[PDB]
Paper text:
The main/3C-like protease (Mpro/3CLpro) of severe acute respiratory syndrome coronavirus 2 (SARS-CoV-2) is responsible for making 11 out of 14 cleavage events for liberating and activating the viral non-structural proteins essential for the virus replication, and accordingly, it is an important target for antiviral drugs (1–4). Multiple studies have identified an Mpro mutation (E166V) that confers strong resistance to clinically relevant inhibitors, including nirmatrelvir, but the underlying mechanism is not fully understood.
The structures of Mpro QM, E166V/T21I/L50F, and E166V/L50F all show a symmetric homo-dimeric assembly very similar to that of the wild-type enzyme. This is likely because the more common trans (χ1 angle = 180°) and gauche– (χ1 angle = –60°) conformations would position one of the two Cγ atoms ~2.6 Å from the His172 side chain and cause a severe steric clash. The E166V mutation abolishes a direct polar contact between Glu166 and the edge of the triazole ring. However, in contrast to the case with nirmatrelvir, the substituted valine residue does not cause a steric clash with ensitrelvir; the Val166 side chain is positioned 3.7 Å from the triazole ring of ensitrelvir for a favorable van der Waals contact, which may explain why E166V confers less drug resistance than E166A specifically against ensitrelvir. The S144A mutation in the QM also causes a loss of direct polar interaction with the triazole moiety of ensitrelvir (3.5 Å between Ser Oγ and a nitrogen atom from triazole in our Mpro E166V/L50F-ensitrelvir structure), although it does not significantly affect the positioning of the inhibitor. Ser1 from the dimer partner takes varying conformations, where either its side chain or the N-terminal amino group interacts with the His172 side chain. Overall, the structures suggest that the Mpro E166V and S144A mutations affect the binding of ensitrelvir via loss of direct polar contacts.
Residue numbers in the entry:
A (entry chain B): 1 to 301
B (entry chain A): 2 to 301
């Protein structure tokens, strides 16, 4: 019963967060085995941040320039390297709290949990989605650089996001743990705009299934539509197209509710064209698109 | 960007255990050498409708309780019942015990919930104690015993232990002293909650949030009395404002330079005139599950 924006328990990641400092620049890092991962922007001074020459800047550094702090303890850096936009610091002590983990690059529309950290201290946890324009609508303040996003599958932590910067519109940009940015952004202190965003249609449908499971059904109708006819209306409203794979992945929700996917699409089409008429769905006046079909199945089963 | 942000759950994850009595199983909270859980665990299927807890507990011994941290058994060496919580003394002090206290939260306040099943944490989310002393949580069967909490630097304030779901789908529970929030009892019967109302103090915090972010079209040059506003609020199914609410709005009042009673008069006009097709923070609805501290917490 109920439906909330639910994040994974963050304990396994909290045990990995540390503080990285270089000169006066400081941000958060991720301590896994005997390696600390953090954004390379940490090696910039104010004069460097606007237009960094990262390769030269890293050559001009030594292990003794990096200050790594796990709580009130200092970790000794014995080696450093750069992988795209992520700095890799080898330390002489392996993190005893390292969980089973892997690095994954998520696709637009997928969700993950974000552990917001400041000066190496976890501050809050929330659930986000990778937007179609490769930004995330996070909640970050100054000092959040290096916070990570993740999913947990059984006992394995999948790290998928490392936070880097805020954009002028208030959305956020970052990389995977290989250091490759999501979207067309660069780790420079310049004003960078994102492309026009779209709505994650498959997630809206899963959320509508969530609404039905919780007894909210006013938006249902007795009509169905074709995948193509629905996609034509979706694109007109800046909604992402629905693929047959999406229809398949919604199968468990359709089977649970007895409402065919294309039946639910006809309800979404009417919502797009007529709006909610002052109504709400799961307490929302807007169509939520940051719940994947798996999140719904997970939270309602 | 404004998100419903929960506290990091690690400090609480290290305290979640499973408690089983016969085949009845739920979650417990392991702090120092004591485990706290709902007393409903001593019920068999046929006792859940109308249990005699005194009688059911008299026929229990330490060796009838199975406490497990993961697959590791913690032997129960003593037990006690306080209100609707059971306190089980175990032979192991939890080495992961954080700094903690027990607190009873007030209506309208928020907290993080660590949803657990069979002693295994499953998810974390933020929610508010509604004015009718229910919470609009997200719980499935087996979530009994999950806890709600707030963290103050290094101190964990435990404020909620989940017990049951009501016919309307909302949830009811106790503080960690075992005292229910609201007029509910731990029986498997249909219990209706009082009529819910909107958390006025949180709507006000949200309006201050909008002003901080540059959304100010709804301000007016009028003020009102606290009493006059509270009388009008009840007419619109809004909760009356308490002196604590006026107090906690102070920092937002000072940050924007807009007096509390001044912002109340702006809200009063919104209630009477509506938004006229306008939006506040990109929303057509007024959010009431963000407290003044949540705003201070997320907006510097
Ligand atoms: C308001 N907000 C929302 N998200 C963020 C994240 N963020 C951040 O936390 N820090 C940044 N710059 C730094 C300044 C520093 C000053 N000192 C002493 N140490 C500092 C360390 C950092 Cl990282 N930035 C800006 C930024 C960070 C990058 F990694 C990047 F590639 C480009 C950028 F413009 C930032 O966005 N703040
Ligand atoms: C769908 N949903 C939403 N929230 C809840 C919470 N919840 C729960 O998890 N369990 C409950 N009853 C039990 C049944 C058991 C069967 N076995 C084998 N072991 C069991 C243990 C419990 Cl606790 N209930 C019902 C319930 C639990 C109480 F603590 C109470 F005082 C009255 C009640 F009606 C429940 O609501 N399920
Ligand atoms: Cl640029
Ligand atoms: Cl007054
Ligand atoms: Mg239909
Ligand atoms: Mg006014």
């Amino acid at each position: 019963s109920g439906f909330r924006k639910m994040a994974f328990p963050s304990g396994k990641v909290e045990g990995c967060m540390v503080q990285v400092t270089c000169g006066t620049t400081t941000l958060n890092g991720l301590w896994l085995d005997d390696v600390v991962y953090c954004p390379r922007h940490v090696i910039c001074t104010s004069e460097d941040m606007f237009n960094p020459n990262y390769e030269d800047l890293l050559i001009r550094k030594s292990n003794h320039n990096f200050l790594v702090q796990a709580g009130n303890v200092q970790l000794r850096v014995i080696g450093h390297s750069m992988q795209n936009c992520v700095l890799k610091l080898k330390v002489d002590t392996a993190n005893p709290k390292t969980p089973k983990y892997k690095f994954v690059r998520i696709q637009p529309g997928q969700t993950f949990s974000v552990l917001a950290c400041y000066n190496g201290s976890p501050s809050g946890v929330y659930q986000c989605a990778m937007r179609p324009n490769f930004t995330i609508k996070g909640s970050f303040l100054n000092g959040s650089c290096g916070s990570v996003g993740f999913n947990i599958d059984y006992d394995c932590v999948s790290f998928c996001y490392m936070h880097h910067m805020v954009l002028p519109t208030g959305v956020h940009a970052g990389t995977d743990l290989e250091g490759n940015f999501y979207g067309p952004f660069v780790d420079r202190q310049t004003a960078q705009a994102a492309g026009t965003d779209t709505t994650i249609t498959v997630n809206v449908l899963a959320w509508l299934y969530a609404a039905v499971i919780n007894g909210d059904r006013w938006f249902l109708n007795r009509f169905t539509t074709t995948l193509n006819d629905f996609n034509l209306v979706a694109m007109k409203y800046n909604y992402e197209p629905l693929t047959q794979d999406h229809v398949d992945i919604l199968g468990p929700l359709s089977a649970q509710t007895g409402i065919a996917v294309l039946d639910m699409c006809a309800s979404l089409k009417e919502l797009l064209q007529n709006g909610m008429n002052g109504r709400t769905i799961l307490g929302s006046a807007l169509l939520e698109d940051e719940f994947t079909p798996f999140d719904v199945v997970r939270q309602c089963s």
